[PDB]
Ligand binder design. Structure first.
Ligand code: UTP
Lengths: 161, 30, 254, 65, 140, 124, 123
């Protein structure tokens, strides 16, 4: 009695390029932006994608080398070959960049920057700041500071444009 | 230990039961 | 006459058993069509999760050498009337029983069924109220409890139901090896020609720092759990609609 | 940053961030996203005497992390 | 029809006691019902109630183990039926010795019998116990 | 005594199964207590086991008849109640004589199942 | 008018409770709405509150009978319908007389429950 593995029912596998192979000139990056097991974008050709990982900002274009990036709460930019821009905001996750010309950005939450409200973002920071002053212990203060970092990133993200 | 010093029809049913259980287990394996 | 009215009363109850069941069919045909959105938006989140964990290994060598605990996390529905999903899962679990088996089932029916049947292997279960959408936090709660149940665990295995179509609900298994065994295999896939498809992926992880790898391991493990519960819910609603048809026909024959 | 030193895991870090991000969303759109960050899970073992005992090994609410 | 409450614990044992094959002497029946009523059988498993009753009626554990300090109230004194039928079992003349008789019987029964019964795993022993309990149904 | 005790236990099992059968037909077999599923499985095996191929009906049955000695009737049923034969398939008890015939039929069914499994596996 | 209105409300509630019983039987008590369960909880109290020990059935029941005045019955049921006694335990309405006897029985039920809790606490 052998059971199927849950990945057998998934028909869109990841294609890796053999290292001993000729290079190709690619003008499109196939992006897959995903939230909580839901793709907002699927193998969607985009000219470029800008992502904020722990070390800093990465601008991924077609042909980018194989890399894994641990994202931080921050904006994410997706620019199509039309030159049109779509800006999301992510709270965390990972970005897998493949040398074959694909980028699978899996996030816990990915919301268009339009949906976020700056007025709500500002008042929320003030509330958490008061708690951080009265936060009982070190652990509570650390959690509160996590919220503030995300809020300030959101506030700064919206003030940018 | 001191017990050691001084001191078939049902077997057929047990034998058959063991064989059937073995076959039912073998089919599971492969 | 009382005897004649005895049948009439009996049929009176049957005639309304149908109405209550018919309303239930309507209730469960709203939630099936509400959760049909996943059908469109699935099959793309778990792409590099395959590389992380997809290993078509034998079913004997992976359980015969159970040096440490094996933590099974079957997915079961809170409410009955689903069908044969829970029964099959129990059969799938009964077929793996071991000395080193620990159970952390999900759902009230899973807890009740696995508490009675295997009483020295069950530890405790997780229950979620089907009020909100199956989210990442619930998956993180499953994993954290699983680790605390047995941190020194050879593997954590999730046994759930995959909704192939409206009438097809198979059983699927996500097997997550613990950090030590995963990083060892990840080290072999990088250096050796064996596991070619994972060569580039493994070397791209070994280049980064360890904490990132540990976060990567936990993150993808959560996604696998999230997919299983999400699928198990969709299979549940689809199965209930079918079962709540069988009851209608049985109540029509009577 | 400083949460790692206190034993907080990465998964709990993400849950806090997601809740905060959902907090900033407009009130009109908050309903959709907030259904994805509302704890509704618990851990229970059937007691000996036909009862249910909750297990406090993992926190459920971001406040108690 | 609709959580181990005293009503539900004692009711199941009452039903188990109600099974009979031959008419029971009044003294034996009333004293068994009394015991099950006052919770003396709460620690006794439902399957073993008849065996408990058989020992109470046709045996005397206190005398067997030399712990009987009663003066007159013993189950082998069949003449006590009419005294019970006159004064009631909740009367000062009879209440104290009855409680002590059932209190010693419960303690001795649980210690020396139920412990061994719950420790039986051998097929031969299991089958032997099954015959015993069924016989106890048709005896008391 | 053994004959009497076995007979009463069988009757009690069948009595309970009848009552559970009312629930089974309306809702379904999977809406029952796990304890009552074991009783159902044992009861179904008893019902199948009670059947017997008669030597006078070799035409209508198509099978050789059986004569079951009372001492094998008691032993076979007593063992079945204990649950030592839970692994045996339900259909193995259908249209057979004593317990030995049940085991032989189970062996043949297992061999056929193994052959089918081998054929399916070889198809890979 | 109060007597007529109270009686009609009782009858309607009992009728509705019987219909809800089918749903409790099929779906279960959990699936009933907030309003429905309040009808269920109130109606069950009405069913048990209609019972009464008679002065001639003391041997059958083993308890003294009660003679409930007409006004007491109307007031007691009127308060029950509008939820004045929603917090009273259900069994306090079983085999009693007027509302006063209900409160006394509830008090007795509370006392014995406290004693049982104390016995459990010592254990
Ligand atoms: O002392 C060290 C050395 C290296 N590293 C980490 O090892 C990894 C080596 O990363 P790489 O060598 O593969 O690339 P990189 O320098 O371009 O990396 P980025 O800044 O673009 O992400 C990077 O993620 C770096 O932060 C440390 O964290 N600490």
């Amino acid at each position: 009695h052998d059971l199927p593995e849950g990945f057998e029912f998934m028909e869109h596998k990841v294609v890796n390029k053999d290292i001993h192979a000729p290079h190709e000139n690619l003008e499109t990056l196939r992006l897959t932006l995903t939230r909580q097991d839901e793709f907002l974008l699927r193998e969607e050709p985009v000219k470029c994608v800008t992502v904020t990982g722990t070390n800093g900002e990465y601008g991924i274009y077609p042909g980018h080398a194989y890399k894994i990036v641990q994202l931080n709460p921050s904006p994410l930019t997706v620019e199509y070959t039309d030159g049109t821009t779509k800006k999301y905001f992510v709270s965390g996750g990972f970005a897998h960049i493949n040398n074959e010309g694909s980028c699978d950005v899996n996030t816990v939450e990915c919301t268009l920057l339009d949906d976020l409200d700056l007025a709500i973002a500002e008042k929320e920071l003030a509330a958490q700041q008061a708690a951080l002053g009265s936060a009982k212990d070190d652990k509570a203060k650390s959690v509160v500071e996590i919220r503030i970092s995300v809020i300030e990133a959101v506030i700064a993200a919206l003030k940018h444009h | 230990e001191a017990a050691e010093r001084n001191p078939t029809g049902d077997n057929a049913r047990d034998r058959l039961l063991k064989e059937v259980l073995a076959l039912q287990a073998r089919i599971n394996q492969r | 006459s009382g005897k004649l009215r005895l049948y009439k009363e009996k049929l009176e109850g049957y005639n309304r058993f149908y109405s209550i069941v018919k309303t239930i069919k309507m209730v469960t045909l709203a939630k099936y069509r509400a959760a049909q959105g996943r059908i469109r938006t699935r099959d793309f989140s778990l792409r590099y999760t395959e590389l992380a964990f997809s290993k078509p290994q034998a079913s004997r060598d992976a359980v015969v050498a159970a040096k440490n605990a094996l933590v099974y996390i079957p997915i079961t529905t809170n409410r009955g009337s689903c069908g044969a999903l829970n029964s099959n899962i129990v059969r799938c679990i009964d077929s793996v029983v071991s000395s080193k088996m620990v159970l952390m089932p999900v759902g009230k029916r899973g807890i009740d069924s696995f508490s009675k049947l295997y009483p020295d292997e069950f530890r405790y279960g997780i229950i979620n109220d089907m009020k909100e959408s199956m989210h990442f936090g619930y998956a993180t709660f499953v994993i954290e409890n699983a680790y605390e149940v047995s941190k020194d665990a050879d593997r954590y295995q999730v046994i759930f139901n995959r909704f192939v179509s409206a009438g097809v609900q198979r059983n699927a298994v996500y097997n997550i090896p613990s950090y030590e065994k995963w990083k060892e295999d990840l080290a072999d896939a990088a250096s050796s020609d064996n596991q070619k498809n994972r060569y580039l992926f493994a070397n791209a992880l070994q280049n980064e720092e360890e904490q990132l790898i540990r976060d990567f391991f936990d993150f993808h493990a959560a996604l696998a759990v999230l997919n299983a519960v999400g699928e198990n819910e969709l299979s549940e609603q689809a199965a209930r609609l079918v079962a709540v048809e069988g009851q209608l026909t049985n109540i029509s024959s009577l | 940053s400083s949460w790692r030193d206190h034993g907080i895991s990465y998964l709990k870090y993400l849950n806090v961030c997601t809740e905060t991000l959902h907090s900033t969303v407009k009130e009109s759109r908050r309903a959709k996203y907030e259904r994805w960050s509302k704890p509704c899970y618990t851990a229970q073992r059937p007691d000996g005497a036909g009862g249910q005992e909750t297990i406090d090994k993992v926190p459920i609410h971001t406040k108690d992390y | 029809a609709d959580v181990q409450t005293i009503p539900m614990i004692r009711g199941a044992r009452f039903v188990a006691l109600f099974n009979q094959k031959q008419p029971s002497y009044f003294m034996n029946a009333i004293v068994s019902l009394y015991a099950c009523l006052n919770g003396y059988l709460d620690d006794v498993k439902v399957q073993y109630v008849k065996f408990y009753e058989y020992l109470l009626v046709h045996r005397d554990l206190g005398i067997m183990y030399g712990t009987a300090k009663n003066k007159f109230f013993y189950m082998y004194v069949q003449e006590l039926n009419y005294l019970i039928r006159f004064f009631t079992l909740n009367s000062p003349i009879l209440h104290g010795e009855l409680e002590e008789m059932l209190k010693q019987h419960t303690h001795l029964f649980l210690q020396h019998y139920q412990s061994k019964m719950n420790a039986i795993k051998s097929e031969k022993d299991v089958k032997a116990l099954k015959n015993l309990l069924y016989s106890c149904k048709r005896a008391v | 005594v053994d004959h009497y005790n076995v007979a009463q236990d069988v009757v009690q099992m069948l009595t309970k199964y009848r009552e559970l059968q009312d629930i089974i037909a309306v809702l379904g077999i999977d809406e029952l207590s796990e304890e009552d599923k074991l009783i159902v499985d044992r009861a179904r095996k008893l019902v199948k086991f009670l059947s017997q191929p008669f030597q006078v009906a070799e035409v209508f049955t198509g099978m050789t008849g059986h004569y079951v000695q009372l001492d094998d009737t008691i032993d076979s049923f007593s063992g079945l109640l204990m649950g030592t034969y839970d692994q045996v398939p339900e259909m193995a008890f259908y249209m057979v004589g004593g317990i030995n015939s049940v085991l032989e039929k189970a062996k043949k069914m297992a061999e056929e199942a193994a052959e089918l499994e081998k054929m399916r596996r070889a198809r890979v």
